[PDB]
Symmetry: D2
Subunit: 455 residues, 4 copies
């Protein structure tokens, strides 16, 4: 079953329906790198679900009532009481987006030499942990690394790996547990309430802190309601509130599940850490009452978080992504499984099994997708993995994928059909997809500006 | 066969459905007239495509640039030059919506006792004609009155009927010909360019004026591009401009094909009529430099009329309607054919064959659609047709229909599926729809606020 | 005393500060007729206070929550309950602006041959009365016609003239009393609560209806609070509510005191007349639940009317106009007295006593004002009075004035200084102002498009 | 002498004042730190000109055209080309505000143990310099530290002090020169073009880099046009472009002179520094294609920077501030002279001569201003100056001031009169202002959330 949009269109965004031949010229001018494409040349932009969401009429009304005061903004107080109500944390500090909050948390909670353990990782989160002296330990369940394994709650932490780490390193040497919901690197996989309670109860017995990377906690809450026995009678808001009752705080990118284009925040329960966070936020972000956000954006984020609690909205969000995955899977197109909350990942290694990884099959598949459909997707393979600057060799990730990342409330099922039909047509002649070679490679951030040509 | 939306969603508004028990209460509280239901008590609102459209990001930018000056507003100049360029008329008078322009035209162009002849009547148009002393004559071809007859360009004027009117009454006794594009009450049926050219040639030879009801002229232009031989390679803009070259002026409800929520205008080429129009607009609408519109709405309407010229937009607009008709027809649901530009018309005579037209099956069907679905639709039969102003009896149209009217850029195909699925289920117990009778009848345009009760 | 703005600036409107020499060229291209000037060439536009107001951040938020449904809009219900609460009338019908409501009232309440009596008149109001068969009778107090007489509540009806009319014409032959607040033609003069009660008590004894032209009722309420003994302890909202308790209904131009750019409405208490008004509004305006307004504008007008009840806002509004009048009066510049609620009127006859009225001193003074300052003002003299089309002679009004009309919340005291300093400088060399002659005169609405040159 | 606002008010927000009894409660609840008061409890908020500006209608139109794409946004391209054109730098990295750019610059350009020399310190700038291992050296001329000394271009660097630093430390030990325009903590004092040219010539000869704090560069350009010989006929844009020709890059808080509520950027000419900047911005701000800003805010800031170039706008901006200073000085109120571009600084040492700087007279004066007036102002003395990071003692600046900071395009001269009149009355019982002492002191940037109590 795939539900209809639980909203109607209030206003539309103009696009340039350029045809295939012109799309080819734009792709060549971008050096076959979708990251170099101009937004104005893209019909359906699936590069990321971060900050690309459509706001409601209620959020736009709030955008007209920005109290832009430097301190004491009414919009901040609205955001504060909303996050306190919905997440249950005692103290909240806004940040301009998620990695601003991660910067704060990692400076507050890590002493050099300590360990941070998590259910896999995200690039910015792990960078700020390591930059502040932590050693990262992956404690995710082993199944999360099987990209073809179709099982529920793949994001769960292995309690046995967590126990092993405590025994071998010592509780006092573990800064915190970093539990992400959902788990982006596994394809957007959810974590169960049962895992969140087990982790809280093991860490509490040792005095270890747990902080959530809550960026897609609402998709996570939908999976819990859909699939975890005993949550059929719970509202999304009830599930979210219980999720965060097992954490000491969180970092949040409002740009994802708060249904906004900018914004985030840091939560915690400890008064002392909150006092230190306020001393630090002014260094990087702004006042504790705006944190690098305009008043109107705190207001949009406060309204959006509350909108995200509506069951019909989050059900349709997740099931629209699932519609895309299901349609591709039905035509035999290889994808990471299960489909996550926010994106479908094509297995470009299997899609283009006639190409070696050094020929960048995901980069090339993403270029072909745009040419055939006007859809932009993200390369998440060897190119994004970067080059080892010491040895000069590629970082070679096991996962060679193209990410079809779905912004919230922006596209329809007909847009999902544009995407799927185009990919399926490409799959039926997949042997024709050509490999790519560098013609320009920057020394760093190569996924952002590298240019290619066909082999 | 059905294109995806040629735009993205920029902002949304939530939708909801109240339980059938409450919809039943609401329907009897509205006296079984859909016009009297409240907006909030409705899930998908297909009452009308008038003023319910979603504007674009460019239009909303123009909404922030309202120049609210009483005379000489930049927004007025923008609207004036846009209409001059796209329609080709010499003069434009803005009005707050279409019936304000009809009011002006009927007072300017009708001597009491003269005939106005058009391709089927429309409620407000015919009232302003008759209020100013004209007798309406319907010169559409007979086929346009048969719901099930699937023929192209049903809106065309019968040239033999027009020739006969000129012969029997004399050209000097005919105020003007009123040529509507599309023809709303025939089902949204288009008029061919060949017919517009033949009407121009025959009227000009007798010195008779031709004024267009331009309200859905862009939907009309799409049908010409799609189906009229020789127009397949002409742009929508080119077709629209040529359409109006066969007219002496027009009335326009911007609320339809100008993609706005309010606004309209009157166009003419004649200098003396324009001078008289400026005197009269001050009485009813406002100064000729704003015509009862805020500056920001003249801006939105100028921007919207130009957006409407985008082929991909209007193709999708029309085919979204066609998708709804195609799904209903594939399931055996009787509809007006061919499907028009703006709405699907259920054939209430066949849906409610157990009822006579004096039991108002169209009014009754629209109530029952709401009760069982929460979708709002409009009566378009005997109740709308009003009473003969000589005998006091019902006007009895062959078309007794219930209109599912699609606002532009608001709903998705998934919303069309919801509508279709709910009508298809209701179709399987159509015998349960009761007949209605008046308990309150307005003395003119009675459909708007009439109240009924079951027989 | 002149209070500071009781608001701050949320957003600004861009203007083109063109210098004096360029202003002269724009004035010549406009044929020395300020009505022909382009808004983009005007620094301070004092043509009218109608629909030129600045909205608040709260109103703009409401502009993002337009429920654009054709019937049953939430915005209409908000407007309805606001007007019912603040004005106290039982029934309300929105109209696109004031003269739309006047059209409705005059068709509902006048039988041909009847009289309508008022405290002077306004052009559109009196047109709709006379168009529907009424004979207008001025029953204002005689002092209102002395433009130099500085006395309070100049707008009051002479109860003796009203009694004389009842005695001579008969109560059954009087359609209604039309009481305007404020009285525009007298320079924006207020009416006292005591006069409103006396008029209600005389008309009620004879069964005569009283309808208010309430367009500037909030300025009127401020004068009552400032100057009528016994109202020092009453809020503006209390005074407004009591004002309308002495009427059977009203016509309202929201474009004035409801702090919006478009909108109005018709109020009444009588159920039967309300039923007839609903049957009529659909002819000219729209549904009883939108009346020719977008949903967002009903919402803006509902919010704006409520904002207009704040004492500090309306005190500053009136005292800012008074600042302009006081400054001019202090330099000896001749003005109509007392200064009204919305505008200062220069006495161009005395200002340019070296010019005859046939040389259009007000038209010329308004052109000089724009050239010297970038301020646009309205000619309210012989030009606007029009020409007698039967005899070809000018209508020669006793009042030859230039109206400095002040939009609400748009300008500062520094802008008022620009206006005053420029006029005072012109007054010090007033003998240099040249007379004007027609070089183009349209047959009607000549103030709107006539062009002049210097004698 | 004082020009009127070169714009109209497009929309407003209400202001209010709570009784003195409640302001007294609020002030002690904020621990006598103005930074801790709530926005709603304030009547005229002069805490800061940062991010509190009123945007224009054109900026709000751009706000509706946010292109929220993660890369390749039209808004990014618009900002990039606008800054390239107006400032002349080769490369731009957006940041969410100015201290995000300062964070990047200090990490990119400072080797630990090197010197950074600037024309007086600023709080966030100096913290990021010292956090990355630099020693700050103040090379502004001595006069800039004397509050009452009325001399032009107080912001100028002392070339002798710069020459001495190069001689004693060596050019290789100097990370860069930090030249701020205007100089905030000297009172908003400007820098001459002659000084910018002389600093460029002396630094280039030693291979030393020069980076500008561009935050109030347009106010600075106005002072150059007004007072520096030879610049009287150059446009603001021309002066700004020439100013930055003497720099290797800049940090910019758009929140000041770009007329926006959020936003900033980092500019540089060097390719290798730009490459390193793109790596670092991803860690702290976001991808180089949005830098932690929504697309709509990059658009607002591009539009705002260009509006800031309008002479009449910036002349009025600066002279509005000067009007406030002129009125205070005419009444004997001790202020910093000359009045700067963005704020009037009351001389707290002379206002509170009965207090020593260890009793924090500036902090105390700002509290008492709020209590007696409801106007909010900011401490700009010993509390802001922080502590010496070697001895642990207060930095002791000669300038102990209370800042009345004027947001751009928000307030009127009448609001300035209210401020001035309230300060003038407080001046006549200045002996009542008590001294303060810390009860809570943050370990860095302590002024933001410090809490005090009376001694
Ligand atoms: C309101 C509708 N029609 C309006 C209309 C009008 C009147 O326009 P306004 O609603 O803008 O007055 C004129 N001509 C045609 C063909 C129309 O369809 C409707 O069909 O729901
Ligand atoms: C917030 C203020 N200043 C910010 C500022 C900054 C820091 O900018 P952000 O506040 O945008 O981080 C940098 N440089 C100068 C000269 C500044 O004045 C203020 O003066 O209130
Ligand atoms: N978390 C978001 C945004 C993001 C973060 C870091 C990068 O390096 C990106 F390319 C994008 C996401 O999943 O896209
Ligand atoms: N009532 C308003 C608007 C108005 C009405 C009729 C005219 O003829 C005008 F010129 C203006 C006002 O006082 O301007
Ligand atoms: K974004
Ligand atoms: K509407
Ligand atoms: K207007
Ligand atoms: K702000």
């Amino acid at each position: 079953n795939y539900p209809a949009e639980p909203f109607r269109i209030k206003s539309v965004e103009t696009v340039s329906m350029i045809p295939r031949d012109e799309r080819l010229k734009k792709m060549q001018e971008a050096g076959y790198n979708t990251f170099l494409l101009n937004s104005k040349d893209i019909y359906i932009d699936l590069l990321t679900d971060s900050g690309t969401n459509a706001m409601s009429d209620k959020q736009w009304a709030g955008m007209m009532m920005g109290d832009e005061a430097y301190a004491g903004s009414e919009n901040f107080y609205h955001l504060e009481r909303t996050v306190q109500e919905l997440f249950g944390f005692k103290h909240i500090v806004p940040t301009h987006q998620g990695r601003g909050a991660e910067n704060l948390l990692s400076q507050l909670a890590i002493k050099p030499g300590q360990y941070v353990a998590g259910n896999m990782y995200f690039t910015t989160t792990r960078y700020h942990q390591e930059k502040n002296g932590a050693v990262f330990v992956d404690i995710v369940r082993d199944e999360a690394h099987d990209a073809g394994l179709n099982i529920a709650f793949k994001g769960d932490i292995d309690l046995k790996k967590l126990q092993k780490l405590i025994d071998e390193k010592g509780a006092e040497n573990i800064a915190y547990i970093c539990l992400a919901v959902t788990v982006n690197l596994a394809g957007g996989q959810p974590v169960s309430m049962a895992n969140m309670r087990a982790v809280r109860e093991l860490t509490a017995a040792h005095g270890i802190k747990v902080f959530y990377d809550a960026t897609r906690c609402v998709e996570n809450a939908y999976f819990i309601k859909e699939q975890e026995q005993g949550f059929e009678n719970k509202s999304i808001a009830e599930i979210v509130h219980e999720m965060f009752s097992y954490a000491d705080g969180c970092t949040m990118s409002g740009k994802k599940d708060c249904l906004v284009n900018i914004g985030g925040f840091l939560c915690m329960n400890d008064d002392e850490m909150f006092s230190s966070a306020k001393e630090l936020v002014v260094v990087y972000e702004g006042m504790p009452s705006y944190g690098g956000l305009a008043g109107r954006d705190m207001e949009a984020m406060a309204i959006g978080l509350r909108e995200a609690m509506q069951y019909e909205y989050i059900e349709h969000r997740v099931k629209q992504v699932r519609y895309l995955g299901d349609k591709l899977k039905a035509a035999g197109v290889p994808i990471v499984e299960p489909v996550g909350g926010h994106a479908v990942f094509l297995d470009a290694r299997r899609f283009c099994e006639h190409l070696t990884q050094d020929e960048f099959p995901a980069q090339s598949l993403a270029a072909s997708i745009y040419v055939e459909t006007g859809v932009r997707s993200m390369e998440r393979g060897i190119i994004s993995a970067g080059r080892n600057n010491v040895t000069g060799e590629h970082h070679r990730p096991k996962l060679e994928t193209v990410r079809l990342t779905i912004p919230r409330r922006v596209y329809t099922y007909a847009h999902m059909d544009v995407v799927a039909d185009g990919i399926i047509k490409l799959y039926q002649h997949k042997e024709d997809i050509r490999g790519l070679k560098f013609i320009y490679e920057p020394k760093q951030l190569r996924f952002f500006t590298a240019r290619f040509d066909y082999i």
